[PDB]
Each structure stands twice: as structure tokens, then as C-alpha cells.
Short mmCIF file of C-alpha atoms in Angstrom, two decimals:
data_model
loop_
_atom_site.label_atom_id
_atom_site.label_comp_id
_atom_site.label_asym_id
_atom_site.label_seq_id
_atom_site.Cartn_x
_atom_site.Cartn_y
_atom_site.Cartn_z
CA UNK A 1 146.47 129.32 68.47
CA UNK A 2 144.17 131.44 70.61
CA UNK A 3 140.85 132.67 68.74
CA UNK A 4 138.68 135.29 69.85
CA UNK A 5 136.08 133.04 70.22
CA UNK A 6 138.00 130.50 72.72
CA UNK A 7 139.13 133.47 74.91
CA UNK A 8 135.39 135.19 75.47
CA UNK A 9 134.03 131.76 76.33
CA UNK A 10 136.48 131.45 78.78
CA UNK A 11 135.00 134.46 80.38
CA UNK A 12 131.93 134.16 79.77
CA UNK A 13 132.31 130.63 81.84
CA UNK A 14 133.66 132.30 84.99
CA UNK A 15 137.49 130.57 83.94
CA UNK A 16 138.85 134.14 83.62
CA UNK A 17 138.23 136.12 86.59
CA UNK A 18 138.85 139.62 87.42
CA UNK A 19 139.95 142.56 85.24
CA UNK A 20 143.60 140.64 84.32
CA UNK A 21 144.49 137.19 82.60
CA UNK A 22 147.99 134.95 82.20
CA UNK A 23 148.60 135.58 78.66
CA UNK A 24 151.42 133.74 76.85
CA UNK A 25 152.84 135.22 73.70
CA UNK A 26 154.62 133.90 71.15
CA UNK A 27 157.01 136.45 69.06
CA UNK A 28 155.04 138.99 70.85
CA UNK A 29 151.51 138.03 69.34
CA UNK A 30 149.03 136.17 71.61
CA UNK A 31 149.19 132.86 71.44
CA UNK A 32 147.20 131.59 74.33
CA UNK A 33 146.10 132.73 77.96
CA UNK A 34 146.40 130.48 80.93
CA UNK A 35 143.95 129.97 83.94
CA UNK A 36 144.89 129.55 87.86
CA UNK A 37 146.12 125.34 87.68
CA UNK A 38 147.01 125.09 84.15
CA UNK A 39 150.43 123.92 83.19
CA UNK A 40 152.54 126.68 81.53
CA UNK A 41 155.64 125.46 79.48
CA UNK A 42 159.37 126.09 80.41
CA UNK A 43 160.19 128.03 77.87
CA UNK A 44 156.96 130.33 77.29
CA UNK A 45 156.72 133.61 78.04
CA UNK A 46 153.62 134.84 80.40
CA UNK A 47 152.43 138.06 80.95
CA UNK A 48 149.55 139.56 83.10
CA UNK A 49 147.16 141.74 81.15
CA UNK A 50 144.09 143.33 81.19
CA UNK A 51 140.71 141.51 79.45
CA UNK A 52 139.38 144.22 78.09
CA UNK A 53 142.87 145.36 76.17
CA UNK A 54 143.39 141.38 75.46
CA UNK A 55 139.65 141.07 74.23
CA UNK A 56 140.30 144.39 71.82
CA UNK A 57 143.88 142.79 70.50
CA UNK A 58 142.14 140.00 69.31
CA UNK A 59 139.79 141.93 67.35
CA UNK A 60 142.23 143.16 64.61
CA UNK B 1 107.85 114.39 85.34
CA UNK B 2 110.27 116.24 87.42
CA UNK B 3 112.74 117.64 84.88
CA UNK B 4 116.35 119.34 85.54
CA UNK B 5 117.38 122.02 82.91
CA UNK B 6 120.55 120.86 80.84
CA UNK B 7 122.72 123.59 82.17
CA UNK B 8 122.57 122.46 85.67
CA UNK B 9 123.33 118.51 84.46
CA UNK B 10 126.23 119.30 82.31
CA UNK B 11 129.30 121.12 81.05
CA UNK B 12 128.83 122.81 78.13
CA UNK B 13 131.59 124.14 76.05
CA UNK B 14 131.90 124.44 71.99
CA UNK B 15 134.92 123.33 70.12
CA UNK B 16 138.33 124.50 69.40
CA UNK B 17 138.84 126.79 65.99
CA UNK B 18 141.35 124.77 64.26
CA UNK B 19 142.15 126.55 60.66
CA UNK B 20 142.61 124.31 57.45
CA UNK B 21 146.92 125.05 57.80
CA UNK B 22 147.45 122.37 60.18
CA UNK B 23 150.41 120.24 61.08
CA UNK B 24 148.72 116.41 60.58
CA UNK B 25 149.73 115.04 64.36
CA UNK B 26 148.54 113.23 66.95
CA UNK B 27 145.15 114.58 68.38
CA UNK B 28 141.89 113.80 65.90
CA UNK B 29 139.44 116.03 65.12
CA UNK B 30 135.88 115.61 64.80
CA UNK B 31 134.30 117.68 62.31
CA UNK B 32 130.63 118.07 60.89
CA UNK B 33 131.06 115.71 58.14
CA UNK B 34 132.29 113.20 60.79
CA UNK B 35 129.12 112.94 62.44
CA UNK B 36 127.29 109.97 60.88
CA UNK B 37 123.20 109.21 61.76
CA UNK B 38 124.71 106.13 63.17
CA UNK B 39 127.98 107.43 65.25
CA UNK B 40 130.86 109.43 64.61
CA UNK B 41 133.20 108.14 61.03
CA UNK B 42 135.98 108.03 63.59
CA UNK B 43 137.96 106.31 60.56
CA UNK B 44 138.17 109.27 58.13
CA UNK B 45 138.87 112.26 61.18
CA UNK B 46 141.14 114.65 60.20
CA UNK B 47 144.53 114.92 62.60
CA UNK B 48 146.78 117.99 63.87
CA UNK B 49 148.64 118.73 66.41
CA UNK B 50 148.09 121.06 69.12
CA UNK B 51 149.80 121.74 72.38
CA UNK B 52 149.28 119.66 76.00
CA UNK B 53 147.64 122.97 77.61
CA UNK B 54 144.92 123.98 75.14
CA UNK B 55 144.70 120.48 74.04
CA UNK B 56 143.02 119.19 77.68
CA UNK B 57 140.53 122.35 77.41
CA UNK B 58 139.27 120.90 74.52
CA UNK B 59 140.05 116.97 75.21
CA UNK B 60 137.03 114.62 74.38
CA UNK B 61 135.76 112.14 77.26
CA UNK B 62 133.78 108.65 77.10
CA UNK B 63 130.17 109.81 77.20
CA UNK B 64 130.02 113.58 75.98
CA UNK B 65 127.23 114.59 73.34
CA UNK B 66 128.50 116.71 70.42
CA UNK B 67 126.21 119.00 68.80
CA UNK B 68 126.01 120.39 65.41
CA UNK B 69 125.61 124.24 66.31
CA UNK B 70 126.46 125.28 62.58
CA UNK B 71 125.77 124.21 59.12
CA UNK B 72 122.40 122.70 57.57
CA UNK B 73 121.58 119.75 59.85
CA UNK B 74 121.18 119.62 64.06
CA UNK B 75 123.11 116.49 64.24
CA UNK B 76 124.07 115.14 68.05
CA UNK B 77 126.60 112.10 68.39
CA UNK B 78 128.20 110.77 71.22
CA UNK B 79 131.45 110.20 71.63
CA UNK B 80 133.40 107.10 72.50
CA UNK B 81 136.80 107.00 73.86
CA UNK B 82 139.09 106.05 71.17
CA UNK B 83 143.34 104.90 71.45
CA UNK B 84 144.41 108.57 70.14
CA UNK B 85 143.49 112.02 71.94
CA UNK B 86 140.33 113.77 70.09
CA UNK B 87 138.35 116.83 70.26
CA UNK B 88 135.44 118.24 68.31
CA UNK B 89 135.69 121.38 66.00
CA UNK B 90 134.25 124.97 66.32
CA UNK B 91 131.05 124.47 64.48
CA UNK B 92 130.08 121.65 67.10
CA UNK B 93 129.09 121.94 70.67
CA UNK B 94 130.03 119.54 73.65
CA UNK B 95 127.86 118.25 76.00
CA UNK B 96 129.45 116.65 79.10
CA UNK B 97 127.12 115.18 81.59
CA UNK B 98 127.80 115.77 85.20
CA UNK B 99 125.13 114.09 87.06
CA UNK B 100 121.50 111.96 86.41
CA UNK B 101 121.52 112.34 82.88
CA UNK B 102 123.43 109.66 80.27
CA UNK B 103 124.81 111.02 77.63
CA UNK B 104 123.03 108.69 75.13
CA UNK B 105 119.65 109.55 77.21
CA UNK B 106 120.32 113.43 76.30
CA UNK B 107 120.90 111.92 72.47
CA UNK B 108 117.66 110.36 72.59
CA UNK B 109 115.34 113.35 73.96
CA UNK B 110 117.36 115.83 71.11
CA UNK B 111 116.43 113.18 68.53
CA UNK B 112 112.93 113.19 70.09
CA UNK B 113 110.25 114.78 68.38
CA UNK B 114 110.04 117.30 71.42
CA UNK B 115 113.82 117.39 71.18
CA UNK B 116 114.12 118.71 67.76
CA UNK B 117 111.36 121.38 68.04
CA UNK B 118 113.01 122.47 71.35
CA UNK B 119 116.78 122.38 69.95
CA UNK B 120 115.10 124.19 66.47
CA UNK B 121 113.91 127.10 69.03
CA UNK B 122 116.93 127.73 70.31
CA UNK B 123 118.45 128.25 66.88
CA UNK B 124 119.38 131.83 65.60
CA UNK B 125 119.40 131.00 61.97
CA UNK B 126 117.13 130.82 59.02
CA UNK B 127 118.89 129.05 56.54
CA UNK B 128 121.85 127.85 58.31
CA UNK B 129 122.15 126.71 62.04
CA UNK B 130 123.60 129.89 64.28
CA UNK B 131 122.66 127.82 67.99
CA UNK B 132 121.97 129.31 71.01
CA UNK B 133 124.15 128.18 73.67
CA UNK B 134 121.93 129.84 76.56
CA UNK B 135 119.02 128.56 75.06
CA UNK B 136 120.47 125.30 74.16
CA UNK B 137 121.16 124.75 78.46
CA UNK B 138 117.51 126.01 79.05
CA UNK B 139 115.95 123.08 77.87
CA UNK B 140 114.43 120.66 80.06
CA UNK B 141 114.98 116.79 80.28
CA UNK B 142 112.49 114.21 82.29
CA UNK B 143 114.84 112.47 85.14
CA UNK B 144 114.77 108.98 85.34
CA UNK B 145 116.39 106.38 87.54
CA UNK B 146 119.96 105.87 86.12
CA UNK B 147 119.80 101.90 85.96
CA UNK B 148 116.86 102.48 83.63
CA UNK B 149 118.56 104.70 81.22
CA UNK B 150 121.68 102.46 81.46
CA UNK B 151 119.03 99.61 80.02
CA UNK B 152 117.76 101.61 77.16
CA UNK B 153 120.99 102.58 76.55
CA UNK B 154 122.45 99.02 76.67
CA UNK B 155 119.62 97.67 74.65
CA UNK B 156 119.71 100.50 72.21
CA UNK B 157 123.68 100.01 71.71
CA UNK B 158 122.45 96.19 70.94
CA UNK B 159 120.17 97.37 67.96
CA UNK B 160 122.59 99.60 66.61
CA UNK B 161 125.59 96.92 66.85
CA UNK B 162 123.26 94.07 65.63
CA UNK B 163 122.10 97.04 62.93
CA UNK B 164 126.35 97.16 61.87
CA UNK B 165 126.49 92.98 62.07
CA UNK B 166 122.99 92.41 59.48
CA UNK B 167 124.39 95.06 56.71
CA UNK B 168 128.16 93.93 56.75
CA UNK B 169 126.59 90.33 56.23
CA UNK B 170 124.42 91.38 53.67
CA UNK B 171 127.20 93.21 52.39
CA UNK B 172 129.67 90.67 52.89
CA UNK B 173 126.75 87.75 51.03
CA UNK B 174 126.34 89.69 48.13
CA UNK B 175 129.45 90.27 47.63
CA UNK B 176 129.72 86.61 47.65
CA UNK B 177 127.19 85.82 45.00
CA UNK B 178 128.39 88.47 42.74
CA UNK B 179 132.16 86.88 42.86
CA UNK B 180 130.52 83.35 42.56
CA UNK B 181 129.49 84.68 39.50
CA UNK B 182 132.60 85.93 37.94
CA UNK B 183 134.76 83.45 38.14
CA UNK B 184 131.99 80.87 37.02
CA UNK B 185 133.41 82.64 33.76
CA UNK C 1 136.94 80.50 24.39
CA UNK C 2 135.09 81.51 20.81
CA UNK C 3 134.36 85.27 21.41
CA UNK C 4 132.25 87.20 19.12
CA UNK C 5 133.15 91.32 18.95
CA UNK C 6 130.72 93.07 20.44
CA UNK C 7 129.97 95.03 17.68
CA UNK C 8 128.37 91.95 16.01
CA UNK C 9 125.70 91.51 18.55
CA UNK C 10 124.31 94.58 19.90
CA UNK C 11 122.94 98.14 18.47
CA UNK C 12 124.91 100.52 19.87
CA UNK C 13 123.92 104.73 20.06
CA UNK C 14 124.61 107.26 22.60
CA UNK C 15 121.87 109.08 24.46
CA UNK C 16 119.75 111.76 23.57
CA UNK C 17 120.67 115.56 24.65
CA UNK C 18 117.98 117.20 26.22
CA UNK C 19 118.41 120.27 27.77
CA UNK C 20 118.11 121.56 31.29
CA UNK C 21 115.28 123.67 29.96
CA UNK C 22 112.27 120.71 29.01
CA UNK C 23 108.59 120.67 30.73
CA UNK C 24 109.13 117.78 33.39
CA UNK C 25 106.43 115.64 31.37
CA UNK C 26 105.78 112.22 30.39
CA UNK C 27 109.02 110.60 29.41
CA UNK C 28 111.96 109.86 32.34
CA UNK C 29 115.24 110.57 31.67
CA UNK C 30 118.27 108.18 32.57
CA UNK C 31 121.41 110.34 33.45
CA UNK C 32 124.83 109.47 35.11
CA UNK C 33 123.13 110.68 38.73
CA UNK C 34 120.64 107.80 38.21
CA UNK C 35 123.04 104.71 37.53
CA UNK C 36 123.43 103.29 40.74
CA UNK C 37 125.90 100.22 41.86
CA UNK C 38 122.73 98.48 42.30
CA UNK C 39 121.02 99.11 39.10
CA UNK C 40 119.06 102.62 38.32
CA UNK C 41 117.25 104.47 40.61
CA UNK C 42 114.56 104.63 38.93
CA UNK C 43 112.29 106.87 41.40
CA UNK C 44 114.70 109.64 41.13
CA UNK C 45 114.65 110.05 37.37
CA UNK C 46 113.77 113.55 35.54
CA UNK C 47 110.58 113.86 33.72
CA UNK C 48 110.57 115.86 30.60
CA UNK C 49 108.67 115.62 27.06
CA UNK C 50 109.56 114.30 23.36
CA UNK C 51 108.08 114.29 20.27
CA UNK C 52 106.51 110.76 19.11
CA UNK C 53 109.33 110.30 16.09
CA UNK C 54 112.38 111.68 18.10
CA UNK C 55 111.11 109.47 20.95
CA UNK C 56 111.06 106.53 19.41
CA UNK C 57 114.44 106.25 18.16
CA UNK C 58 116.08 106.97 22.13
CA UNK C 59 112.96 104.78 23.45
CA UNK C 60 114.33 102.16 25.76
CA UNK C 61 113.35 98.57 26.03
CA UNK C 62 113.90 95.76 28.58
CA UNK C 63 117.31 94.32 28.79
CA UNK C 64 119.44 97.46 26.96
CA UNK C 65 122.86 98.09 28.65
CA UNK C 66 123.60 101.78 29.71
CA UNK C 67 127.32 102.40 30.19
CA UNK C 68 128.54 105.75 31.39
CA UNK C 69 130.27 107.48 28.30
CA UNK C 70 131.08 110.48 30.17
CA UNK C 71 131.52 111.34 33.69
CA UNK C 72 134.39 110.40 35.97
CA UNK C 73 133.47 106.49 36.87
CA UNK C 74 132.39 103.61 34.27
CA UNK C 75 129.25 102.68 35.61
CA UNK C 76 126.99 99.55 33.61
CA UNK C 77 123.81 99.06 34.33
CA UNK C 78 120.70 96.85 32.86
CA UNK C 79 117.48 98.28 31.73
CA UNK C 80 114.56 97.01 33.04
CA UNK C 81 111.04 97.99 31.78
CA UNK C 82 109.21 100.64 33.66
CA UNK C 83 105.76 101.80 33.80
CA UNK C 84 106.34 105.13 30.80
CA UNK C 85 109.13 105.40 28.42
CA UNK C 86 111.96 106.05 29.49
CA UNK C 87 115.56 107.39 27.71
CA UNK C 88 118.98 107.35 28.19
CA UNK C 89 120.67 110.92 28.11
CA UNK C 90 123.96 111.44 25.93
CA UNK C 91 126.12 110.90 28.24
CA UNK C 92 125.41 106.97 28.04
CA UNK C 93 126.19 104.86 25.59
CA UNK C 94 123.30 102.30 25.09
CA UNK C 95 124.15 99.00 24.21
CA UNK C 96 120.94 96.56 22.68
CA UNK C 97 121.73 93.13 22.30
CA UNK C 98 120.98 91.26 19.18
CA UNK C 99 121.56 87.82 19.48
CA UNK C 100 123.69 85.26 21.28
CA UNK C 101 124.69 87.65 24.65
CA UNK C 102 122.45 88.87 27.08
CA UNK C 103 122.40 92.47 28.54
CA UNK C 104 122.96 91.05 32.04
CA UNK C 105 125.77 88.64 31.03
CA UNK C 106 127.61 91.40 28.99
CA UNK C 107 127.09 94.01 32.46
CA UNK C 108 128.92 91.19 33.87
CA UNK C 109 131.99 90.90 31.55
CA UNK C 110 132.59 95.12 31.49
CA UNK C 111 132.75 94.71 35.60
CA UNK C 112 134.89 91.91 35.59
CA UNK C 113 139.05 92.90 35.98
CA UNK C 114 139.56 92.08 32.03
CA UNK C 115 136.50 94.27 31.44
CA UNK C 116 137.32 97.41 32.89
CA UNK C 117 141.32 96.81 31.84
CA UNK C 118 139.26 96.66 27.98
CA UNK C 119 137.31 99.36 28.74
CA UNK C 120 139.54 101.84 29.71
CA UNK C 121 141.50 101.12 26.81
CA UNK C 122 138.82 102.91 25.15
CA UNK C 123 138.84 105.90 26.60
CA UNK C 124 139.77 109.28 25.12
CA UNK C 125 139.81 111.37 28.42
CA UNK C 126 143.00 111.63 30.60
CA UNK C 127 140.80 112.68 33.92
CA UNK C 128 137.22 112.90 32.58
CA UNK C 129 135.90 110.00 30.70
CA UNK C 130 135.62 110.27 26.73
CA UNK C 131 134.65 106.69 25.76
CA UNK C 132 134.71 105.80 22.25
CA UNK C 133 132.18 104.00 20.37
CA UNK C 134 134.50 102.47 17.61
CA UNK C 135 136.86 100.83 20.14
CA UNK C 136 133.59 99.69 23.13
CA UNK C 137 132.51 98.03 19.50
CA UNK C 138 135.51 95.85 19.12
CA UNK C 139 135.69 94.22 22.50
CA UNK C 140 135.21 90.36 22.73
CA UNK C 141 133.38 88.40 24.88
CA UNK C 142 133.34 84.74 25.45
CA UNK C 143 130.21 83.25 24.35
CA UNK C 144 128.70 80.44 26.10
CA UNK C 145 125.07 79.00 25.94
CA UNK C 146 122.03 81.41 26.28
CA UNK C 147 120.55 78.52 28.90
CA UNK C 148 123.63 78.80 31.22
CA UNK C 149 123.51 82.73 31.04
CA UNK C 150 120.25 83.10 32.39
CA UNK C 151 120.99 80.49 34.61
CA UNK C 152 124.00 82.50 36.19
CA UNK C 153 121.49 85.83 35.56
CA UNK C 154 118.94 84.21 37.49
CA UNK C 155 121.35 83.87 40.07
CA UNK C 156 122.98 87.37 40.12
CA UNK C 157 119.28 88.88 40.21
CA UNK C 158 118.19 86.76 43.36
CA UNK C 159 121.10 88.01 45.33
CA UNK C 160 120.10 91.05 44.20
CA UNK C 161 116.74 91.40 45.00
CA UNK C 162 117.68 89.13 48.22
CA UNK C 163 120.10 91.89 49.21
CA UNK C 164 117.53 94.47 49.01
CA UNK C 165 115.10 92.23 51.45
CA UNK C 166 118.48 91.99 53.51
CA UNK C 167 119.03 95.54 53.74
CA UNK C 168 115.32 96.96 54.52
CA UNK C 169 115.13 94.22 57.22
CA UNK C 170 117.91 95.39 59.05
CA UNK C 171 116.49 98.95 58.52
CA UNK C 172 113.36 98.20 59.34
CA UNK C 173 114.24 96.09 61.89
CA UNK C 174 116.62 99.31 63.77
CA UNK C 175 113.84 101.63 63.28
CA UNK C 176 111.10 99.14 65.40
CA UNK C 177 113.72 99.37 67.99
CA UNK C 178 114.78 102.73 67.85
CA UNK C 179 111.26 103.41 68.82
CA UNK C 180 110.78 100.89 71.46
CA UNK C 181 112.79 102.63 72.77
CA UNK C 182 111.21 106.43 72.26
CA UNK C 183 108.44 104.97 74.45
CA UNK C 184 110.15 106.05 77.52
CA UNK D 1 115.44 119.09 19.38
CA UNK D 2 118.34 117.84 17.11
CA UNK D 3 121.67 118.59 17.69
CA UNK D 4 124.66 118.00 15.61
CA UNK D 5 125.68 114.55 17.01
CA UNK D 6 122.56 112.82 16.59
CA UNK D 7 122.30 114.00 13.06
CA UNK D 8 125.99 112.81 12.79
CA UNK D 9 125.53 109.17 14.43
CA UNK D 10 122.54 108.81 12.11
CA UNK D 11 124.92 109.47 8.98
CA UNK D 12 127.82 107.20 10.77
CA UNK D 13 125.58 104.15 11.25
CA UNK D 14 124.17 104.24 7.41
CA UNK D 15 120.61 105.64 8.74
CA UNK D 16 121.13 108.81 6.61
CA UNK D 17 122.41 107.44 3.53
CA UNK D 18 122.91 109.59 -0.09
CA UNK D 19 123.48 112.92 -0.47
CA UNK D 20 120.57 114.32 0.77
CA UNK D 21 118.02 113.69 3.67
CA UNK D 22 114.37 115.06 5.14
CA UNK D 23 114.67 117.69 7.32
CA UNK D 24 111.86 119.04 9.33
CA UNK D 25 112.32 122.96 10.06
CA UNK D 26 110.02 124.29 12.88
CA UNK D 27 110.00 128.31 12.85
CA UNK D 28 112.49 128.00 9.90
CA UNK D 29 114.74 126.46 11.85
CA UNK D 30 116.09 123.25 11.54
CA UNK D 31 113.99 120.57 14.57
CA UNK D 32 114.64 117.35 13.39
CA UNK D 33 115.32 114.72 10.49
CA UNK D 34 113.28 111.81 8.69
CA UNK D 35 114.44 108.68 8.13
CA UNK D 36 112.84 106.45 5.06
CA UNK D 37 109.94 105.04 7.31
CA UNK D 38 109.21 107.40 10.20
CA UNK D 39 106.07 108.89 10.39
CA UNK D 40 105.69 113.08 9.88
CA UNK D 41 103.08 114.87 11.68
CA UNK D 42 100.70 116.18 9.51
CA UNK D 43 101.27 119.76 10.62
CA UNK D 44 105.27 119.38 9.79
CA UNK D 45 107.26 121.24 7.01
CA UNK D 46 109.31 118.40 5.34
CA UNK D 47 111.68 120.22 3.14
CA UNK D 48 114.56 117.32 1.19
CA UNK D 49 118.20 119.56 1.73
CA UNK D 50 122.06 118.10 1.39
CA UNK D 51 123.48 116.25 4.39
CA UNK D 52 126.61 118.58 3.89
CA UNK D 53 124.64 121.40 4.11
CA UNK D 54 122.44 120.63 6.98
CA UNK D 55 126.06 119.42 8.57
CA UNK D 56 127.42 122.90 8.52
CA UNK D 57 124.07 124.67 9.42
CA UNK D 58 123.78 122.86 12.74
CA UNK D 59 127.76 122.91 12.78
CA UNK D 60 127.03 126.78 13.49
#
């Protein structure tokens, strides 16, 4: 599971760059976001979104 | 000296959030009460499972330092590869050296007197530990050839194996003596 | 083996209650915190006062067996005379040999596998421990000379004290070079 | 301080023997017992009461 913590580190490091991140969702909750070589699985379900709307989901 | 700041040496990162509802698995976790004055307790480490992705963003390598940045005490370990897959929890902060610096030579300057008064003024907290990562990767570390750290670090591994050999024997004597005893009744 | 109950040969009373509110003062306290594996921790004890006459019933004396009465593990240890008068709290049960056994041989019996099988045949509590008196009383011990107990007791208390040495050399010894290596 | 076990382990191991014993009473209150040859300050109130009765008034 993604935590708000984990996901603002990542930007923070320069690992998420530019105004939109790979998000994955499970059950249409985030469940984790996925960088440029990263391995996403077959049967996961990625969508591009914006950080600052991603960063402000993760705060409820 | 000449001395290079730690954030230009290594790759820092804290640990993954894991909650207490976890699946027992595979991957070990090291946790603040895992981190012993002489090592980590990699015998009594908690396990879960988490998935291949997020799990190598948070995978453990021969040679980082893990720092307590929460709770009561500024502990620093480092880690040694182990046969299962481990990473270190939220409330601890991993140190991977990149270049010049051992990761047992950055143990000994944050257990240096200088060390603890420099890793105590990057902390945020009164009464518990709230670290600073910024000011955590500010602070500087003398450079020394790396065979020479390599020999501290050899001999120092010595002391504290030969430390784990002279207690289990004096474990293992009395132990001895006091079942010598018993059955002589 | 002739046993003798142990009832026969010791004075047995629990521990005086004293209260969290006492002046730390004169008199140390022995309480469940202070019964070590290795005998009591004596530096560690809590300080409080006692009048003369209440004192000198609970007064402890050299060689007195304290066994942990309440609590959640059976701990048995040996009293061994200390620089002020010292007590054991009521949650031990103090155990004063009278003649035949020594303290040291009967620590020895209660920690062998028979001893703790007898002993926690007298407890009252299902997960806290409730020990009772009448029942500790009636548990026999072989008796064997007094010679050939101190004999073995002189040999349990060199290991012990050797075990100590053991232990703050191998401290001492990975502090000296935990410093070497500081120098640098 | 006495409390109600220590005056009962001194009746259950024959210290405290008859019907009646020396009680000390500090304030009015009830501080301690005397056995046969323990010593009394000189500025204590030795007052000679029923063992059931000082039972039930430290029983309270």
C-alpha cells in the first residue's frame, strides 16, 4: 500500500518528475504509483494523473 | 581534514510504512526494537509480504546504515545481507553509501561523541526523536583512504565477533557448572 | 533418599507491604523487579523507612531464601548480607532455614525440574502467580550432609562470581577496543 | 503500617495467641501490634483489644 509519506519522498527525491505520475489503482483507490523503468504487473491497472490531485487524494 | 557532506556520499531514503494488519510472508522487516547496541536481532524480525515493485524501492543491501529517526533512542545499525529479502520500517532511516565512505565508518563517526551532538542537532523533537532528513545529509564526515577504514572495520568486526565468542562461553561454562550441580543430586 | 518437609526446617513469612508512598530512607526494599537470575540486584533496590519493632520482624539476615509469591515467573534467590537492613516486600515469601538445609542448597532443589513441577503444584493463580504457604511448607527435600552442601555451594558460588569476572572481561575487554578504534 | 495480613500471619503462626493482643493506635488509629517481648516506644499508646475485633477493624 502507498502512504502519503512514500509518495512525497518520491518527489521530493526528483523520482517523480513533472506535473503527472503512473498511478496504479486497485478497486479504484491508489494503491501505488510507478516511476519511468519500474516493472508494472500484467494485470494492474495504470493511470496518468496529476501530483498535486494525487498528493490531495492521499490526504483524506 | 578534508570532509564530504553525507548527502553527496550516499542515498538516503527512510523506510516503508508497513501497518500492524500484515500478511506474515517472505520479506523481513526491521523495526526499532530490532536494532540491538551490538547489530540488528535479525532472529526475532517481524515478516510480511509485499509486492516485487515497491518491495525493490525499499530492498535492504550489504553495507547500508539504518537510523533510528523516531522514538526515544538515535540508534544506527548496519545491515548485513541475510538468505531472505529485508527492509527497514518507517520510523528508521537508510543510509546507502555511494562512494569513499564505509558504511561501518559512517556508524562509527554517528556513535562518535561529535556524531551524536551533530545527529542530536539535527533532531526536531524534545521528548521523542522527529529527525531531520536535510539536516541529517548536512553533516560532515573526515575522508580517509578506503583500505584504512576497511582495517578498522575488519578489526572492529574482530572485537565484536570475539565480544559474541567470550559471552556464549561464559554463558555456555556456567551453564555447565550449574548442571554439574544438579544432577550431583 | 530421607527427606525432611520443608516446613520442619525453615521459618517461613511473606514480605512486608509498604506502600508506594514511604520517604526513600534507611532501609532497602527487596521486590520482584530486584530478583535477578543471578541473585538480587542489590544496587537497584528502593530505600524507604520503618519503625525499629516493625523492622525487626521483616529484617533480613544472611542466607534467607526469597521466592517470588506473586508475579508471573517463580524466581529463588539467596540473601546475602548487605551494608543496611534490608526487607523483603509481600510479594515474596521468605524462607529462613533452621537446621539441617542450607538456603543455597534448598535455591537449588526449587530450580531443579522436580522443584518447579512441586512448586507449581502450589500455586493458586491460573495466569498470575498465587503461591500458597501451606502447600511451599510441605515439600520434601533430600537431605544429605551439611559438609557436602557447602561443598557443592562453594562450587555453585565460584562459577558464579567466575561468571561475573567472565562477563566484565569481555565487556571491558570490547569497550578498550571499541575505542582503539575511536582514535582515528 | 499494619495491614490485615500481617496481623493475620501473626495469629496463623501462634505469635498472637489468646483472645486478645497489644495494639498500638497512632492518631486513634490502629499502627501496629505487640508481641509478648517487643519493645514499645515510650511515646506509644498501648491499648490490650480482642483479636476478633481488631480483625474486623482492619478488615474495613
Amino acid at each position: 500500500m502507498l502512504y502519503i509519506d512514500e509518495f512525497k519522498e518520491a518527489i521530493d527525491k526528483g523520482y517523480i518528475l513533472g506535473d503527472t505520475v503512473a498511478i496504479v489503482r486497485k478497486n479504484g483507490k491508489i494503491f501505488d504509483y510507478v516511476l519511468p523503468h519500474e516493472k508494472v504487473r500484467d494485470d494492474e491497472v495504470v493511470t496518468v494523473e496529476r501530483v498535486e490531485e494525487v498528493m490531495v487524494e492521499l490526504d483524506k | 581534514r578534508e570532509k564530504v557532506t553525507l548527502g553527496t556520499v550516499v542515498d538516503c531514503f527512510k523506510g516503508k510504512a508497513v501497518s500492524s494488519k500484515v500478511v506474515p510472508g517472505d520479506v523481513g522487516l526491521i523495526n526499532l526494537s530490532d536494532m540491538g547496541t551490538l547489530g540488528i536481532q535479525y532472529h526475532q524480525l517481524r515478516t510480511f509480504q509485499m509486492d516485487r515493485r515497491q518491495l525493490l524501492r525499499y530492498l535492504l543491501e550489504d553495507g547500508d546504515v539504518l537510523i533510528a529517526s523516531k522514538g526515544t533512542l538515535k540508534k544506527v545499525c548496519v545491515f548485513h545481507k541475510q538468505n531472505r529479502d529485508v527492509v527497514a520500517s518507517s520510523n528508521i532511516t537508510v543510509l546507502r553509501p555511494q562512494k569513499l565512505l564505509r558504511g561501518y565508518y559512517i556508524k562509527f563517526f554517528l556513535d562518535s561523541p561529535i556524531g551524536q551532538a551533530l545527529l542530536d542537532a539535527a533532531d526536531h523533537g524534545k521528548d521523542v526523536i522527529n529527525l531531520s532528513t536535510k539536516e541529517l545529509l548536512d553533516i560532515p564526515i573526515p575522508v580517509i583512504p578506503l583500505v584504512k577504514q576497511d582495517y578498522l572495520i575488519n578489526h572492529y568486526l574482530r572485537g565484536l565477533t570475539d565480544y559474541h565468542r567470550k559471552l556464549n562461553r561464559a554463558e555456555q561454562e556456567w551453564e555447565y557448572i550449574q548442571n554439574e550441580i544438579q544432577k550431583g543430586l
